Every structure is written in structure tokens, then in C-alpha cells.
Enzyme design. Structure first.
Site, PDB file in Angstrom:
ATOM      1  N   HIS A 195       0.848  -1.179   0.000  1.00 24.27           N
ATOM      2  CA  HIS A 195       0.000   0.000   0.000  1.00 24.27           C
ATOM      3  C   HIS A 195       0.885   1.231   0.000  1.00 24.27           C
ATOM      4  O   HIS A 195       2.099   1.150   0.183  1.00 24.27           O
ATOM      5  CB  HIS A 195      -0.950  -0.004   1.199  1.00 24.27           C
ATOM      6  CG  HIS A 195      -0.292   0.308   2.502  1.00 24.27           C
ATOM      7  ND1 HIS A 195       0.689  -0.485   3.050  1.00 24.27           N
ATOM      8  CD2 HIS A 195      -0.498   1.310   3.384  1.00 24.27           C
ATOM      9  CE1 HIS A 195       1.077   0.028   4.201  1.00 24.27           C
ATOM     10  NE2 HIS A 195       0.372   1.119   4.427  1.00 24.27           N
ATOM     11  N   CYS A 226       0.007   1.826  -7.060  1.00 27.08           N
ATOM     12  CA  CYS A 226      -0.820   2.435  -6.028  1.00 27.08           C
ATOM     13  C   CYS A 226      -0.200   3.714  -5.497  1.00 27.08           C
ATOM     14  O   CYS A 226      -0.893   4.502  -4.856  1.00 27.08           O
ATOM     15  CB  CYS A 226      -1.063   1.464  -4.881  1.00 27.08           C
ATOM     16  SG  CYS A 226       0.380   1.041  -3.945  1.00 27.08           S
TER      17      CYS A 226
END
Length: 1170
Positions: free
Chosen positions: A976, A1124
Site C-alpha cells: 500500500h 498504487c
């Protein structure tokens, strides 16, 4: 059934399969099964959408951990710090003697002294990697209790093992308040960590566990059906932080002694931004520990899904190509050389003559300068017709007779100065001197006497005369016809029996013609090297001496060169004042006083005299002289007698002028004179004068002075500041900061006025708008009017993009907005030096300028209407900190240092060690930080390699190396990325609300054509704190606000928990879920990476981010983006004042624009009600 063409199709399909098998056998032993790899990737995706985003953890390896320990010099205590030992048996360097980790602490900790881990490899078959491991963990408690753990693993070559060890330190109690800080209007608390007289604060625990996994690759390739990976977490030790003890774990004291190469060791830590008192409940503590553990296990499991997917078939990856170091270096080197050439241009000024503005004033003062001597002259050939005069003071009572029977004598006393009296000297008078400049006056002297009759002064009690005997003569024989024969003897006092030898002679008086003539005055300057230019100033001069004087008016001033004897040549401006002094007109008021005796003492003449007898049988004449008188005093003594009609007692004293003035006295101070205008006496007069009262007054020239002048004074320049920048900068940021520091001097001081600063900013904005080649401003005003009015406009996003692009292109406007903000904030120069090696970025400042200006022109109100109150304005206006950049900067500098920057004359170095953040390194940003974090958790991002062995290679070695490569290339992407945007509010005397906006996104899918519940999604939250308290050490203490005060309902908290922790809280109330969300975001990003910008946060960019957080778009990130990280990088560009990305839908930025304009308008309306 199937025809013959179908049989041909079948045979060619089988032939193609056999060709595939041939290719696979050509490449190697690794499987290449596309369909199983695809199912594996889809299942790993489905898992990865469940890895928690919270808590914030900051992974460091050994190198950055040591760098961070060197950076941080205050207390460095982390709520959870997990030391992870991780290794893949395919990458371990089997040539080593031992596979070890040993790291220790050098202080006392309640649970921990050292941690030792040794890996032993019982079996290892390198053809088909089949490993059998034995990990032995040994921990030593402070009392030297040795605790042992064992772990045994059987599995494959490319599967990872992680040993995690957590050292928990919870702050459970602050004690106080112990007073009140006065600079920060907050109560003072204390945090007791060490053995002291107080009750301990920190409670310490630990948590040890092992993670291992079995990727079922072999039976997948055998049965040709997929099988999800299995990860197993083995607990080994969990000591809850229940009781409170001294000496918690400080991370500046942990030493990482030994680690065998090939083993991966990271430190995974969450440190609070501000100190915050935790929760004492058991279940809360254990959830706080297990959320950390769960995030670490989740990242591990994701990495293992990646490894299985690469082992099943071929996955191709592109490594993110790195920035160019060499091109940026060339660019910066060219910029530096441009600075050097600017310095070379400024160096020419060292061959010119530069000036500066000069201005001052000299007040009405009294000053004294004395001449060589008082004005005195002596008429010559002065003979006295009285009984007692200059020389002879003899009684008639004493026995002195002459050839007459009881006939007293008749004396004559003569005064003879030897020499000429003319003196012509011109003086170098000293009126005033100083550090900066020195004024000297000048004049000349003229002396020659006028012819007038002598003056005698009468003493009623005259002092010891030079003619004072004990015995004078004797009588020996008398004559009938001739007369009394005398034998003169002239001895004088002092004699053999006496003390305090003395002597003095009376000095006559006459009046001379004095001519004291002034023509100029001259002031010298210390640093003036040549003629000053543009001389100005106005003077009036008035004298007083004797009885007459001069008043002179001089107004013109001109430069001049001269030389003095003490410092050399001097340069300055002079005044034409031409005059002449003459006091013979009325000098006659000192007649009352003036008896002057001249000090002449010697012991040589004791008892000496003239010897001769003259009378009856001796002739009437003698001719001889005693000349020790002449030696001692530069004249002659006369004593001679004749027989004739009448006798004279000739006693003549002869003196020189210079020796006379060598000892001159002004006795008879009985009727003392006073200044011509009754002025205080100047310490050369009546200042314990002790009989010395008139010689100075006829010696000293005392006058009145006042005046002032102005000019431009040359000076040598030194090293100009551009030469200084070229000679001692290191960086392009230092060039920029030196330019700002210099330009703060050229700006006016009319801007320290709120109205004039607002006027200047309005002029700058009009310049910005008038220069635009397109009409985007009118349509932006239309959009703002629609929004203010409440209608919804679809292309507000494009209006915003046009404004942000224009501000990004007009860099002159941004630079001048930044310069005025730096000038008008309290202590601009201190701030620029605080910045250190970073720059304040001016984009957000100009962005807020444009926003506020557009809304103000839409409602048609001037900005001075909303900016009314008392100073400091942000404490007295509810909106000034929101719409004004200077007030926001002032509020942030007050908050950051707790008002220690308003201390007087504080320097940046002393001030920079006074930050109120917990664990503030000296390399951190003064303003709250703003960046994107994208790093793997629990393992490195590169493997630790080996060198090629120099023996002959073995096929199993080749196969093992291939397996290691495939297990490591492309499997270590972070799961992430996230961004934080924090903003401060000032609410009352000593209270702030810190509103921290977290936003992160999970890893993007390998398969993006799936529905949204299986794709990567974002999750954000806005958690508010309150700063009321401070410690005895100068750092804040946070109290966390509930979900209501943050704007969330119960259902909103449910959705936020599902977005941030990846799962439904089963058995958590909204209070517990909000406690989790709030406590998960307060952690800090610790890193060795340096930023080179400083960004100022705003309320309305906060509302823009809250738009993405509260109403997320319906967007497929996996098909649009490649990483991301790119999403949070685009949101970070938007937060820093730049334009929205073009990858977004239209309505996303539309809604952001409308939310910010609505927020600002509501603020301005509520402020209008006053």
C-alpha cells in the site's frame, strides 16, 4: 461424432502441446503453467484486499536505523517496535560459519537485555530444494535469566521464515499539573521514566512470535489444481504491559551487534507524533498489540502470494526506473556557475567608490579647551616709589641703621623680564570625538602689547618675600667727620633652621591686544576614505570669552581633507565661519582681583650674600655679583649703595618669562567671577579647583555648541553578499534562501502595516490577472458565483485546473507573494535561517491568495472588511488565520515552538532545539510534514547477494540460484501507499485542535476487470486532537477527540473501520472502533530520507481532501493507474497547491472545488455577522 477435419484439428492441437513441452524442457525445471498462475494471482488479489491499512508503521533496515539514532537526540520511545529476522533458505550464504542475529541494549529495561538467534540447517537437498531448519531463540532478562525457545521448520527452498520480537511501551500515567508554563499558556506535566522520587509512567511488555508458510507449489504442479497458500503464526511469548516500571526501552540505546550476511533484519516502529496517554484497559492494550502484529502478518502473507504466483509460471515485471542523478547534477552545476558569474560582476564594485546615507544630531552641550597659558604679560623697568613693593618687605622695627643717626632707608624695587613677549600659534581645538565621527574646531592666536602705564596691587598681608633676613648688619666704628661706616650683609630666609623652603616675586600687569580668529571647523569620519558628497546641515555659532564675543551664522557645508597627529588623515565636511575677537574694548572688570605670586623655591642660596665694607677710608663704589641667583632663577640680583644726597636700597629681581609661566598662581579668589551667561562650570573651573580658579578661566576657551549635518559618506564595501553566496553555499536551496534573506532588505517597512500589506497583495494580484492571455478568470468567477449561490457546476474541476496551472506558470507572482509573507511575519529572518537546507514552497500561498480573491470579488467585499481586530490578529479574529498567509504563518510558528520564538534576540540554532513534536530529529521539517510513504514492511526490498564462487559450478547450484532469483525478482512490492495532511487550529488562549487527514490505497490488482468489492480501494479518515498540556521539557501532550466531534455517525465509523482495518469489527462497539482508528493514525513517519521543501497547510485544502475521504469516487484504480503510489502522489500534488490529475473523472475535482468554495463562503458569512 467428429469428422476428419476435426481429427486434423485435434492432431495439430496435440502437436502444439508437445512443442510447448519441448520449450519448457529447454528453459529449465521450473513449472510454466499459465492457468494455475492466473488462478493464483486472482486468489492472491482477493486476499490482498484484506490487508489492513492501519496502524502506521515505519520500516527501517540496519543502516537507516543507525542514521536515525544519530539524528534523534531527545527521548525516542515507541509504542510498538518490532525487530523482524527474515530469511529465505535459498538466499542464505551457506559458506558462513554460523547464521546469527545478536542485538542488545546498553541500559536497564524491565524485560530485555539481549536477543540471540541462530539458524542451523539440518538437511538441504539442492536439486529440489528441501530444507530442514532449526531456529533457536535465546533471550536474556536483566537479572541474567536465560530463556530459550526452539522452532523447527520443514518445507521448501524459496519459502520465507520471519521471527518477530516486539517491545511495547505504553504511556499510562502523567503526573501533575506541576505548575503552569507561561510562554505556552498550558499546565505543566511530568513524564517519569527513570528511577526518581515519583511514580513511573511507562508500562512495558513484549511479544515474540514466528511466522512460517507452506506454498503448496509441488502438489499444485502434480495435481494441476490450485491450492491456497497456508501461513501459520506461532506464538512464543506475550507479556502484557500491565504494571508500571521505570526505565522503558529507549531506542537510542539499542545496539545491533551482529547479523550474518544474507539474513534480512528490519526495525518496524510506530512512534507517536505527540505524547498521548493510552488506555489502561486490558482488552484495549491487547488490541493495540495485535493490530501491529496483524499488519505485519498481512504483509508477509501478501509477499508469499507473490512468491507462489511467480513459482507457478512466468510473471514479467518492470522495475521502476530511477531518477537521473547525472542530469540533475549538470543542471545544478550550471546554476551554481551562474551564481559565480553574478559574484564576478559584483566584484567590480570593489573598484568603485560606494556611499551610504548619514544622519544625526548634536545637542546643546558645554565643552572646555584650555590654551598653553593664561593671557599675561609684564611691563619692563618697573620701579616702586613706596615703602613696600615687589621685592623689599622689611620692617622699620628691626635694627637697621645707616650712616645717619637713626635714619631709615628708602628702597627702590625693579622688575625686569628678560626676553620678547611675542607668541603666534594657531590651535587644533578638540570639541567632540566619538566612535562614528569626531568634530574638531580651529582658530588662531595673535598677541602684541599696547603701551600703557604699569599696575601695582597691594597686599594687606603679603607672603614670604625674597627679601626676608634674620640679621642685616652690625655697627663697628663711627666717625666724627666721615660718618657711620656700614658693613652690609644680605642673608635671606629660609635659613639652616627652617622647614618648607619658599620664595616668590610680585609680577606687574598691563593689557595687550588679543585677536582670536576663527575661519573653519572640521569633522573627521573614521571609515571615510575620500570626499563625502551631498553635504547638508545647518549651524549657528556663538562664543564667550573675556567680555566680548562673536555670533556667527554658517549654513553651507562642503567636503574637506585634512590630517591629524593621532590617527592620521581624516575626511569629512567643514563649515565656513569667519570671525575675529577683540577684548580691549571693555576688559576692565577683573581689576578687583589679580595679585599673583610666582612659586620659586631652592635651598642653594641658604645664607649667601655680598661681602664688602665701604665708608670713611674705603671708596664709595663696589662692582661684583653673585650669579647662583642667575643659575637658579634666570635673571640677576642687584644690591649697590653710594654716598650722596640721598640713599637707595637697590634690590632688583630679574626673571624670565618662560620660567615665570612655569609656575604661575592665581591667588586672591576672594571675589570670584562667574560665566558670561551663568552656565554650569566645566570641570576646569571651580571643580575642587583648590586655588586654581583663574588661570584656567583666562586659559580655557569655553563656548556653546549645537547643530546637525547630513551627507553621503564613502566606504570600502568588503565582500558583497553575492560574493558571499558564491563563496560559501553548498546547494541550490541555499542560493534561494540567501536570495530571500537579501531581498528582505530591499522591501519597504510600510508593509509591517496590515492595511498596506493587503494593498500590496492586491496590486500583485492585479498584475497577475491582467497578464493572462486567456479568459479563464471570468469563467472561474462564474463558477464561483454558481457555487456560492448553491447550484452545482460540472466543470468546476477544469476551472480549478486552469487556475492552478496559471499559478504554477507565473513564478514571479509566487516569489513575490512568498517574499511579502516572509517580510511581514514576526521574525522573517529567523525563520529563513531556521529552514536550514529546505525551501518554503510558495505554491500554496499563491493558491490561497487566488481562492480568497475569487470568492471576495464574487461576494463583492474588500478583504480589509474581514480582517479587523487587535494584534496578534489571529487571537482576535476567527477567520484571519484562515484567509491570510501571514497570520497562518505566525500561528504555526507560535504552535510549533510553544512561543519560545517570541523570546527576545533568540537565534535559530537555540530555537531549533525547542520543537514540540515527540522524537524530533534535527533533520525534520519545522512545519508539519506532507509526503507519501511507499515501502515494504517486515522485509527488505533487495536481497543480500553473493559473489560468484570460483570453483567449477554444479547443476544443483545453478538450479538453486534460479529458484532464488525467481523467488526474489518482482515479489517485494509494498502492499500500500499512504499520505498524511495535518492542519492546526487555534481555538482559545492555550488550546489547539490538530486535525490529521490520513489517506491510503492498497496494492493494485493484477486483474482489474473484476467488480469493485474485489479491487484495490482507498480508505481515509480525519481524526482531531486537542493540545492543552505541555511537559517540563517543552513537548506537547495530546488528548484525542471522539468520532462525534470529527463529524462521523455510528454507520460512518463502521464504514471507516471496514475501509482501514480490512475487516468488520466483530464484537467491537463504535467507541472501540473509533479508538482503533484514532490510535492507528497518530503514528509518525520515521525515515533517513530528506525532504527539500516546506509546505503550509490550509483549512480549505483540508476540505478538498475530506471530499475524497467522505464521498469517494466510483473509480477503477487498477485499470487507470500503474502503481498504487501514483494515486497518492496525485493527491499530494493537489494538496501542495498544484492542479488535479487528468486520470480522474470530471466530477471528482468538480466536487473538490465546490467544497472548498462553500467552506470559505460559510466562514466569511459567519464572520460578516459581527
Amino acid at each position: 461424432n467428429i469428422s476428419d477435419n476435426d481429427e486434423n484439428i485435434l492432431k495439430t492441437l496435440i502437436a502444439d502441446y508437445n512443442l510447448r513441452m519441448r520449450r519448457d524442457a529447454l528453459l529449465g525445471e521450473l513449472a510454466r503453467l499459465d492457468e494455475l498462475r492466473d488462478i493464483s494471482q486472482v486468489k492472491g488479489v482477493e486476499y490482498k484486499v484484506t490487508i489492513p491499512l492501519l496502524p502506521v508503521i515505519s520500516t527501517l533496515n540496519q543502516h537507516e536505523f543507525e542514521i536515525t539514532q544519530a539524528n534523534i537526540e531527545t527521548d525516542f520511545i515507541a509504542d510498538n517496535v518490532t525487530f523482524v529476522t527474515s530469511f529465505v533458505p535459498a538466499d542464505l550464504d551457506l559458506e558462513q560459519t554460523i547464521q546469527r542475529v545478536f542485538f542488545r541494549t546498553t541500559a536497564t529495561t524491565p524485560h530485555f537485555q539481549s536477543f540471540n538467534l541462530v539458524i542451523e540447517i539440518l538437511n538441504y537437498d539442492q536439486d529440489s530444494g528441501d530444507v530442514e531448519l532449526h531456529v533457536k531463540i535465546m533471550i536474556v532478562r536483566p537479572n541474567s535469566d536465560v530463556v530459550n525457545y526452539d522452532y523447527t521448520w520443514i518445507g521448501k527452498d524459496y519459502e520465507r521464515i520471519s521471527v518477530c520480537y516486539n517491545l511495547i511501551s505504553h504511556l499510562q500515567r502523567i503526573d501533575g499539573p506541576h505548575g503552569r508554563d507561561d510562554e505556552a499558556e498550558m499546565p505543566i506535566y511530568r513524564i517519569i521514566r527513570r528511577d526518581s522520587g515519583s511514580i513511573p509512567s511507562y508500562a512495558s511488555g513484549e511479544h515474540l512470535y514466528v511466522i512460517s508458510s507452506h506454498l503448496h507449489v509441488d502438489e499444485i504442479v502434480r495435481r494441476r489444481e490450485h491450492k491456497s497458500i497456508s501461513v501459520d503464526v506461532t506464538q512464543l511469548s506475550l507479556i502484557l504491559p500491565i504494571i508500571r516500571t521505570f526505565n522503558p526501552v529507549d531506542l537510542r540505546e539499542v545496539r545491533i551487534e551482529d547479523i550474518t550476511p544474507g539474513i534480512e533484519f528490519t526495525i518496524n516502529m510506530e512512534v507517536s507524533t505527540y505524547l498521548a496517554e493510552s488506555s489502561g484497559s486490558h482488552v484495549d492494550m491487547q488490541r493495540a498489540i495485535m493490530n501491529h502484529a496483524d499488519k505485519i502478518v498481512g504483509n508477509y502473507t501478501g509477499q508469499q502470494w507473490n512468491v507462489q504466483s511467480n513459482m507457478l509460471s512466468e510473471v514479467r515485471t518492470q522495475m521502476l526506473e530511477e531518477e537521473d542523478e547525472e542530469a540533475r547534477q549538470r543542471g545544478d552545476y550550471t546554476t551554481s556557475t551562474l551564481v559565480q558569474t553574478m559574484a564576478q560582476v559584483s566584484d567590480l564594485f570593489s573598484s568603485t567608490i560606494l556611499y551610504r546615507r548619514a544622519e544625526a544630531r548634536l545637542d546643546n552641550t558645554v565643552g572646555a579647551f584650555e590654551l598653553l597659558r593664561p593671557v599675561l604679560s609684564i611691563p619692563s623697568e618697573y620701579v616702586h616709589n613706596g615703602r613696600v613693593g615687589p621685592i623689599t618687605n622689611i620692617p622699620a622695627n628691626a635694627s637697621i641703621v645707616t650712616s645717619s643717626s637713626s635714619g631709615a632707608g628708602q628702597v627702590r624695587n625693579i622688575f625686569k623680564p628678560i626676553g620678547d613677549q611675542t607668541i603666534n600659534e594657531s590651535h587644533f581645538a578638540n570639541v567632540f570625538s566619538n566612535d562614528e565621527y569626531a568634530i574638531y574646531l580651529r582658530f588662531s592666536y595673535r598677541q602684541a602689547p599696547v603701551q600703557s602705564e604699569t599696575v601695582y596691587l597691594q597686599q594687606n598681608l603679603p607672603s614670604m618675600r625674597i627679601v626676608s633676613p634674620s640679621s642685616v648688619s652690625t655697627t663697628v666704628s663711627t666717625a666724627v667727620i666721615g660718618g657711620n661706616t656700614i658693613h652690609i650683609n644680605c642673608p635671606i630666609r629660609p635659613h639652616r633652621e627652617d622647614r618648607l623652603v619658599s620664595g616668590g616675586v610680585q609680577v606687574p600687569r598691563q593689557s595687550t591686544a588679543v585677536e582670536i580668529r576663527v575661519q573653519e571647523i572640521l569633522i573627521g569620519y573614521r571609515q571615510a576614505t575620500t570626499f563625502p558628497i551631498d553635504t547638508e546641515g545647518r549651524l549657528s555659532l556663538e562664543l564667550m570669552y573675556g567680555l566680548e564675543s562673536r555670533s556667527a551664522v554658517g549654513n553651507t557645508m562642503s567636503p574637506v581633507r585634512f590630517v591629524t597627529v593621532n590617527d592620521g588623515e581624516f575626511f569629512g565636511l567643514t563649515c565656513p565661519i569667519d570671525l575675529t575677537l577683540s577684548t580691549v574694548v571693555d576688559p576692565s572688570s577683573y581689576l578687583s582681583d589679580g595679585v599673583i605670586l610666582v612659586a620659586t623655591a631652592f635651598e642653594d642660596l641658604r645664607g649667601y650674600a655680598w661681602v664688602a665694607t665701604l665708608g670713611g677710608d674705603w671708596p664709595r663704589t663696589y662692582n661684583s655679583s653673585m650669579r647662583a641667583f642667575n643659575v637658579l632663577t634666570g635673571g640677576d640680583i642687584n644690591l649697590s649703595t653710594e654716598y650722596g644726597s640721598e640713599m637707595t636700597y637697590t634690590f632688583k629681581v630679574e626673571l624670565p618669562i618662560v620660567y615665570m609661566f612655569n609656575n604661575m598662581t592665581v591667588i586672591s579668589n576672594n571675589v570670584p567671577r562667574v560665566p558670561v551667561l551663568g552656565v554650569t562650570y566645566a570641570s576646569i573651573y571651580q571643580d575642587s579647583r583648590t586655588e586654581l580658579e583663574a588661570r584656567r578661566f583666562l586659559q580655557t576657551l569655553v563656548f556653546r555648541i549645537h547643530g546637525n549635518w547630513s551627507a553621503r559618506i564613502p566606504y570600502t564595501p568588503g565582500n558583497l553578499p553575492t560574493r558571499n553566496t558564491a563563496n560559501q553555499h553548498q546547494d541550490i536551496q541555499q542560493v534561494i534562501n540567501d536570495s530571500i534573506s537579501q531581498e528582505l532588505g530591499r522591501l519597504s517597512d510600510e508593509l509591517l502595516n496590515m492595511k498596506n500589506r493587503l494593498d500590496h497583495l492586491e496590486r500583485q494580484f492585479e498584475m497577475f490577472i491582467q497578464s493572462q492571455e486567456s479568459e479563464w478568470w471570468e469563467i472561474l468567477l462564474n463558477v464561483v458565483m454558481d457555487t456560492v449561490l448553491g447550484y452545482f457546476s460540472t466543470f468546476a474541476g477544469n476551472a480549478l485546473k486552469s487556475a492552478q496551472q496559471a499559478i504554477s506558470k507565473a513564478v514571479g507572482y509566487t516569489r513575490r507573494v512568498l517574499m511579502t509573507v516572509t517580510k511581514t511575519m514576526r521574525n522573517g529572518p529567523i525563520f529563513t535561517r531556521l529552514l536550514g537546507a529546505k525551501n518554503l514552497s510558495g505554491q500554496a500561498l499563491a493558491s490561497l491568495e487566488t481562492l480568497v480573491e475569487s470568492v471576495l470579488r464574487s461576494i463583492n467585499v474588500k478583504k480589509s472588511r474581514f480582517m479587523s481586530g487587535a494584534e496578534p490578529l489571529y487571537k482576535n479574529n476567527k477567520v484571519a488565520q484562515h484567509i491570510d498567509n501571514t497570520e497562518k504563518m505566525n500561528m504555526m510558528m507560535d504552535f510549533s515552538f510553544a512561543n519560545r520564538n517570541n523570546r527576545q534576540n533568540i537565534t535559530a540554532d537555540t530555537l531549533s532545539r525547542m520543537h514540540t513534536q515527540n522524537a524530533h530529529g534535527t533533520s525534520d521539517t519545522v512545519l508539519p510534514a506532507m509526503r507519501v510513504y511507499y515501502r515494504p514492511l517486515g522485509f527488505l526490498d533487495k536481497r543480500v547477494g553473493e559473489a560468484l564462487h570460483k570453483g567449477i559450478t554444479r547443476p544443483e547450484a545453478l538450479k538453486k540460484q534460479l529458484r532464488s532469483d525467481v523467488a526474489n525478482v518482482g515479489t517485494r512490492a509494498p502492499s500500500h501507499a499512504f499520505m498524511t495532511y495535518t492542519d492546526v487550529l487555534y481555538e482559545d488562549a492555550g488550546s489547539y485542535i490538530v486535525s490529521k487527514r490520513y489517506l491510503g490505497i492498497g496494492e493494485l490488482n493484477r486483474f482489474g476487470r473484476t467488480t469493485s468489492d474485489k479491487n484495490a480501494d482507498i480508505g481515509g479518515v480525519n481524526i482531531k486532537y486537542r493540545v492543552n498540556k505541555i511537559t517540563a521539557d517543552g513537548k506537547y501532550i495530546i488528548d484525542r477527540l471522539s468520532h462525534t466531534e470529527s463529524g462521523y455517525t455510528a454507520a460512518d465509523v463502521d464504514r471507516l473501520y471496514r475501509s482501514l482495518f480490512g475487516k468488520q469489527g466483530d464484537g467491537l462497539s463504535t467507541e472501540q472502533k473509533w479508538m482503533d482508528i484514532s490510535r492507528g493514525v497518530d503514528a509518525k513517519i520515521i525515515s533517513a530520507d530528506m525532504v527539500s521543501e516546506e509546505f503550509l497547510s490550509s483549512k480549505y485544502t483540508g476540505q478538498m481532501i475530506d471530499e475524497l475521504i467522505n464521498s469517494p469516487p466510483q473509480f477503477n484504480y487498477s485499470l487507470i493507474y500503474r502503481n498504487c503510489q501514483d494515486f497518492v502522489l496525485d493527491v499530494l500534488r493537489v494538496a501542495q497547491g498544484f492542479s488535479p490529475s487528468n486520470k480522474w473523472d470530471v466530477s471528482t475535482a468538480a466536487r473538490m472545488q465546490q467544497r472548498r468554495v462553500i467552506s470559505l463562503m460559510d466562514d466569511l458569512m459567519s464572520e460578516s455577522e459581527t
